[PDB]
Amino acid sequence: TADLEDNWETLNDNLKVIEKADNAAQVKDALTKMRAAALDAQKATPPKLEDKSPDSPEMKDFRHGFDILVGQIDDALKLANEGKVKEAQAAAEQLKTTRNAYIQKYLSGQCEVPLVRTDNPKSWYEDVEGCGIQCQNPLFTEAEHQDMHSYIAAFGAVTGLCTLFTLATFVADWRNSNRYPAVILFYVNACFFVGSIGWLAQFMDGARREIVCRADGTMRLGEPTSNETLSCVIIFVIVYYALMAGVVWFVVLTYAWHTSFKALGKTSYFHLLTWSLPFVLTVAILAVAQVDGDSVSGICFVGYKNYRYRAGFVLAPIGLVLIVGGYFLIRGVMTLFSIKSNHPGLLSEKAASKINETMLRLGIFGFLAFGFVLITFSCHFYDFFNQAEWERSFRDYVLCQANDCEIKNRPSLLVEKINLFAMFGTGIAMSTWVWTKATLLIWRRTWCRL
Amino acid sequence: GTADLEDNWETLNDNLKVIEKADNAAQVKDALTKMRAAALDAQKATPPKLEDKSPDSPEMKDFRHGFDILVGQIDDALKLANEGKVKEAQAAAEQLKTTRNAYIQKYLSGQCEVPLVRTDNPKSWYEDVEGCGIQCQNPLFTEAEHQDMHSYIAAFGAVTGLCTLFTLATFVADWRNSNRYPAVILFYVNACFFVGSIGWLAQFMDGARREIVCRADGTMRLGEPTSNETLSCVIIFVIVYYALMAGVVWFVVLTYAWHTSFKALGTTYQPGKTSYFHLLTWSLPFVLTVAILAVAQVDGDSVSGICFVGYKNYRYRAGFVLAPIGLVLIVGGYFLIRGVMTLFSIKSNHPGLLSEKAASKINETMLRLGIFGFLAFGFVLITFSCHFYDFFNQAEWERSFRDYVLCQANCEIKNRPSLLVEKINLFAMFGTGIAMSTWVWTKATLLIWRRTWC
Ligand SMILES: CN(C(=O)c1ccc(F)cc1C(F)(F)F)C1CCN(c2nnc(-c3ccnn3C)c3ccccc23)CC1
Ligand SMILES: CN(C(=O)c1ccc(F)cc1C(F)(F)F)C1CCN(c2nnc(-c3ccnn3C)c3ccccc23)CC1
Ligand SMILES: CCCCCCCC/C=C\CCCCCCCC(=O)O
Ligand SMILES: CCCCCCCC/C=C\CCCCCCCC(=O)O
């Protein structure tokens, strides 16, 4: 009925009355007028969002900020009706916080897209006071975000269910399956399963915004931070630790294949050699606070803002597992070449058929993992080689939108999809370790246990 | 001086401008000659900033010394100009711009005020103070405090180098019999402390400290690997950081060997032996070192005389030094406690086995491996406590450093790092090297060297 600008001024005016009021009747009346102006403001469409759908995320977030505000006005009203003026004034002072962190960005004029109005100085973009970078990655369209989300949902669900089956198959036969070198594939699978949970957490109701955005709607950058939720650092820890634990268990896989010949139980502190390196690296990223959120990937990761951190903590360790894993695979084929030439009557003897089965299967999984890890490496390499320029194009676009503006260059979502194909694909390929006639018997034995 | 200091300074600049722009090889030799004279008259002068100062004061002595290195570099450039090497004479003349700006300009009327120094390298400019960079010598510590630290590092580093080199030599002299677990773990620990000692001692070579810790423009090394700077800083960092990180991981292996060697006597557990934990021990420090180089957080420090991680930004020291050492204390500590539990269990379940009557060689090796492992834990813990003090206080020190530096542009130092905490760190760090090197101080070593003495 009334204009949004007037409704906003009614909120300002009545807030002044509450703080300089001596009685709860003046507070009650000011809050009642605020509740009316908040609800009517909720019905209005911000001037910036006239081209936007009423069911669009910007409009839904706009309306949500007033839902929080109306609840807080109602909380202040039960206090005022209790004759608690001091407490009602205190609750009313919290309306300023909500108005400024959630709604203000839709009533500004001070900031221009992709910048967003926020009173939080820790959220401000470089030297621009009062404005922070919007949570939604400004270099990619809503259509490119949604296409990417459907892509992660699909690949993430498939990897999650495949790896979960392999884990369930292993624990069902844990007495007979927890034996080296077979149990290496159990931990490889656990790594990609936990990793998938990390990638899939964004698909829960309102989870992507909780993970990737700051409470004031700006993008999560340089986490761990003060007065922000733990959702970002949790997703990063799940994704990054599982990713790094996965490439380390891959080296163990190549090592097991390289030593499967010298040999033809063994469950000791092997875990110390595998879980330590991703722990130290994860802890190092948390101490240097280079954890950032991203709306298109829907996760929190390292080196999204500053590419060097992705190069140091993702590219370089994966490059080292490739050269170490590659070494054990080459040495493994040389030993296979040696045993085939020097002793032709080893693979030509049926006496050790169980040795021939496990060694051939180990090598297949070892080389398959290597190929996918090499694709994963190449995509992080393209990103390392080009993100300095992309960061400059990001900053240049964001800045002339304040003072037509073009995006010179941007990250490639295709390269990201290839990386995810190879990353989730390792998880799906490694899960086929349990896709044998022997596991059909394990689930039959599990069914006959009731 | 016959001519004014500001007059001779203008002559020094004008000739330096007609060197890179000079169209004659004779003009290069002519401009270098006129500058040599202009510097010697400027050296005679007393800057108004130091007119209250005695002529034998540290300040006046450093002002004159600046003109000695300036004249000395002209001699290096005049011999190249006389040999017709125009490209080499102009390249050596750019090192004169550094000597003028970084060592002498602070005593004259100029753009910058100590601890800031004139630099034509924009990468060195401190914040919004255009044309000025932070001087290489740490402004928080005096020359005497620096000299006292350098003597301390020299004594501890030379002793740690010689002790570890003796232990490495003894192991390689009897390699067929010495290359055995858990004994050979002490050879790899010693190898880390030896290599690390070379890193710390590199600064004592002639003019090496300045090359390690300073930029070509005379400002301190920060955020290394830095473009168009020498690799001397990152080489020293890699040697010190990698050796430090490998050493504390080889310490975890030591505690592991102690626990599992006892476990192997009492239950189904393989000792130790043909196990390549080498993969973790060399990889974990490699992966950490490459991450630091990729995020370019290596910095130089004149008081330590090395390049290290997180000097400028304490969070990098916390993530790459404090957190890893803390992790080695919980894992190493865990294996030591488990090791004593197993030790008591063997003594209980196998009466008299670990004695001079029964398994005397196992008893003896397990006894000194435990004393070395508990001693090393104590030193690593002292090391951790010192890196923890630094982590807990550097956000303040960084703020005090910035506030002091900017105040001199447009005060007093509120707080600063503790050099005592650093000496205690170096005592326990080098002390581990010296303590772990005594593994070879037995009668059997005398026998090894007598048989090696042909
Ligand atoms: C960083 N990025 C920006 O846009 C951006 C944001 C802020 C900033 F200040 C400056 C910039 C920049 F422009 F870069 F300069 C992008 C974010 C999206 N994008 C992705 N990257 N990686 C992954 C991935 C694959 C495997 N594991 N992971 C984590 C990934 C996975 C799915 C979808 C997209 C992915 C490429 C890099
Ligand atoms: C960082 N430091 C500064 O002064 C400085 C410089 C620039 C800057 F922008 C801000 C600052 C400030 F904010 F002040 F911190 C100091 C450097 C000296 N100092 C040392 N620290 N550590 C070690 C050590 C022990 C074992 N291994 N190692 C590497 C060490 C060893 C010998 C002598 C000194 C050592 C304490 C910290
Ligand atoms: C573009 C070419 C660069 C990539 C090739 C890297 C070459 C590295 C050379 C040899 C690999 C050595 C790796 C060490 C494996 C030792 C493992 C062990 O046996 O314990
Ligand atoms: C006491 C033995 C020290 C040996 C140190 C040498 C090994 C370290 C390797 C490279 C360090 C590079 C620093 C050399 C400085 C160059 C000296 C100069 O020309 O000014």
Swiss-Prot record, chain A:
List of residues binding cholesterol = Y304
Q: Which stretches are transmembrane?
A: 152-172, 181-201, 233-253, 269-289, 313-333, 362-382, 423-443
Quick one: effect of changing W433L?
In basal cell carcinoma and ameloblastoma samples; somatic mutation; constitutive activation of the smoothened signaling pathway
Localization recorded for this chain is: Cell membrane; Cell projection, Cilium
Carbohydrate-modified residues are N227
Mutagenesis or variant effect for L322F: In CRJS; constitutive activation of the smoothened signaling pathway
Q: Which residues does the entry place in the Extracellular compartment?
A: 202-232, 290-312, 383-422
- Post-translational modification as stated in the protein's UniProt record: Phosphorylation by GRK kinases is required for interaction with protein kinase A catalytic subunit PRKACA.
* Disulphide bridges, residue numbers: C111-C131, C135-C213, C232-C300, C400-C405
Q: Pull the Cytoplasmic topological domain ranges from the record.
A: 173-180, 254-268, 334-361
Known disease link: Curry-Jones syndrome: A multisystem disorder characterized by patchy skin lesions, polysyndactyly, diverse cerebral malformations, unicoronal craniosynostosis, iris colobomas, microphthalmia, and intestinal malrotation with myofibromas or hamartomas.
Q: How does it assemble?
A: Homodimer. Interacts (via C-terminus) with protein kinase A catalytic subunit PRKACA; interacts with free PRKACA subunits and the interaction leads to sequestration of PRKACA at the membrane, preventing PRKACA-mediated phosphorylation of GLI transcription factors. Interacts with ARRB2. Interacts with KIF7. Interacts with BBS5 and BBS7; the interactions are indicative for the association of SMO with the BBsome complex to facilitate ciliary localization of SMO. Interacts with DLG5 and SDCBP. Interacts with GAS8/DRC4.
This molecule's function is given as:
G protein-coupled receptor which associates with the patched protein (PTCH) to transduce hedgehog protein signaling. Binding of sonic hedgehog (SHH) to its receptor patched prevents inhibition of smoothened (SMO) by patched. When active, SMO binds to and sequesters protein kinase A catalytic subunit PRKACA at the cell membrane, preventing PRKACA-mediated phosphorylation of GLI transcription factors which releases the GLI proteins from PRKACA-mediated inhibition and allows for transcriptional activation of hedgehog pathway target genes.
Q: Which family does it belong to?
A: Belongs to the G-protein coupled receptor Fz/Smo family.
What the entry says about domains is: The N-terminal extracellular domain mediates sterol-binding which is required for maximal activation of signaling. Contains a second sterol-binding site within the seven-transmembrane pocket which is also required for activation. The activating sterol is likely to be cholesterol. The extracellular site is required for SHH-induced activity while the site within the transmembrane pocket regulates basal signaling in the absence of SHH.
Name recorded for this polypeptide: Protein smoothened
Q: Which organism is it from?
A: Homo sapiens (Human)
Q: What is the lineage of its organism?
A: Eukaryota, Metazoa, Chordata, Craniata, Vertebrata
Q: Which gene encodes it?
A: SMO
